[PDB]
Amino acid sequence: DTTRIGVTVYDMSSFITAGKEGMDAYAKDNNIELIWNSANLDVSTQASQVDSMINQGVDAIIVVPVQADSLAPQVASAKAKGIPLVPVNAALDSKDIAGNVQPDDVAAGAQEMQMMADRLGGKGNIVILQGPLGQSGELDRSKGIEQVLAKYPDIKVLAKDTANWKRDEAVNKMKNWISGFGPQIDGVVAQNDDMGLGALQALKESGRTGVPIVGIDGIEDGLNAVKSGDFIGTSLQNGTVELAAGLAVANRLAKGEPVNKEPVYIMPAITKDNVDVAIEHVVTERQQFLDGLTELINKNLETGDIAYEGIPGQK
């Protein structure tokens, strides 16, 4: 019979919106019904959504948490009712969950900042666009960015602020920074591609181009920016793969089947060197890719390498 898995995401970001197709594909191949909800970047709303899924007696719950330091009563309630609660993509600061399917966000932060350090030759002024404040990917990517910045004291941070993963909020923040700092800005380090693209749109609207921008995710428009040189690079977080892996882990936990409950998604570097294959998987041959996805996920669960999808460089 049908395994009902609740999924409550922080918001319908570009990453989550594209990723969900991977979840759908794995679910069709495994008779899983997804019970969906999005929490508007509101912790109390997400809490209520988890509570509702518990009351509905779903077989497992995936949470993509608004903030890391939250949801303790929902975590305990799920455990109390025997329902596996599995943070996927963003993390909770709790060990009372049933599984945990996460990217290495500290590593991705460091990787993006290292791309920017290389481009700049270790010197220059940057601004940093952050994810939602208190969300694990914001905290972790900040940590990784700061660990590289320590190694490059001639790189100076002019400002940093959140744009909540959103392109339109990033345009706004960048427009203000252009008015404040103008020609001092030598680079933009965006904690995701969407915010990088907003920064790009702001720069262009002010008549400035060729400013180095780096992002994380490799969404369609980010990959396109890498190809065209509007971005210096990105880090692939293919949500069709990572979210389907989280779904697979939750499904096996729901059914009492043996599984690695805590695989980690290592984001490969995307540059002009390998962007074409990423574009094939994510954009132009996406249906080919999805046709092989269930097999890929099932293998990757046993190797632990849940990011593997044959991007040149991966082994």
Ligand X SMILES: OC[C@@H](O)[C@H](O)CO
Taking the complex as a whole, the smallest distance from the CB of residue 256 to ligand X amounts, in Å, to: 29
Return the amino acid letter for 82: G
Rounded distance between C-alpha atoms, residue 247 and residue 243, angstroms: 6
Which residue, 59 or 194, is less far from ligand X as judged by CB? Answer: 194
Read off the DSSP letter of residue 90.
S
With tokens 């900040």, the residue in question is 142
CA nearest 4: which of 61, 75, 79, 47?
Answer: 61
Rounded distance between C-alpha atoms, residue 27 and residue 133, angstroms: 32
Q: Does 38 sit near ligand X (CB under 6 A)?
A: no
Greatest Cα pair distance, the chain, in angstroms, is 62
Stretch near ligand X under the rule CB under 6 A, chosen from 9-17, 257-265, 285-293, 305-313? 9-17
Coil, helix or strand for 135? coil
Which residue, 16 or 250, is less far from ligand X as judged by CB? Answer: 16
238 is in an annotated binding site: no
Q: Does 162 sit near ligand X (CB under 6 A)?
A: no
Which residue, 24 or 104, is less far from ligand X as judged by CB? Answer: 104
Which residue, 3 or 49, is less far from ligand X as judged by CB? Answer: 49
Taking the complex as a whole, the smallest distance from the CB of residue 300 to ligand X amounts, in Å, to: 18
Q: What element of type H or E holds 61?
A: strand 60-64
Q: Does 130 sit near ligand X (CB under 6 A)?
A: no
Which residue, 3 or 89, is less far from ligand X as judged by CB? Answer: 89
Stretch near ligand X under the rule CB under 6 A, chosen from 12-20, 32-40, 118-126, 250-258? 12-20
Report the residue from 216, 225, 269, 297 that binds ligand X according to the rule CB under 6 A.
216
152 is in an annotated binding site: no
Which residue, 91 or 97, is less far from ligand X as judged by CB? Answer: 91
Q: Does 11 sit near ligand X (CB under 6 A)?
A: no
Coil, helix or strand for 278? helix
With tokens 């190797």, the residue in question is 303
237 is in an annotated binding site: yes
252 is in an annotated binding site: no
Q: Hey, how many other C-beta atoms are within 10 angstroms of the C-beta on 95?
A: 7
Q: Which of residues 223-262 bind ligand X (CB under 6 A)?
A: 237
Q: Does 137 sit near ligand X (CB under 6 A)?
A: yes
Q: Does 289 sit near ligand X (CB under 6 A)?
A: no
The first and second tokens of residue 186, run together, are 């030598």
**Beta strands of the chain (E only): which ranges?**
3-9, 32-38, 60-64, 85-87, 102-103, 124-130, 155-162, 187-190, 213-214, 234-235, 264-265, 269-270
141 is in an annotated binding site: yes
Angle at 119 between CA 115 and CA 120, to 5 degrees: 115
Phi, psi of 68 (to 5 degrees): -70, -40
Q: Does 8 sit near ligand X (CB under 6 A)?
A: no
Bridge partner list, 103: 265
Report the residue from 15, 152, 231, 289 that binds ligand X according to the rule CB under 6 A.
15
Annotated binding site for D-threitol: 10, 89, 141, 192, 217, 237
Which residues are near ligand X by CB under 6 A? 13, 15-16, 89-90, 137, 165, 192, 216-217, 237
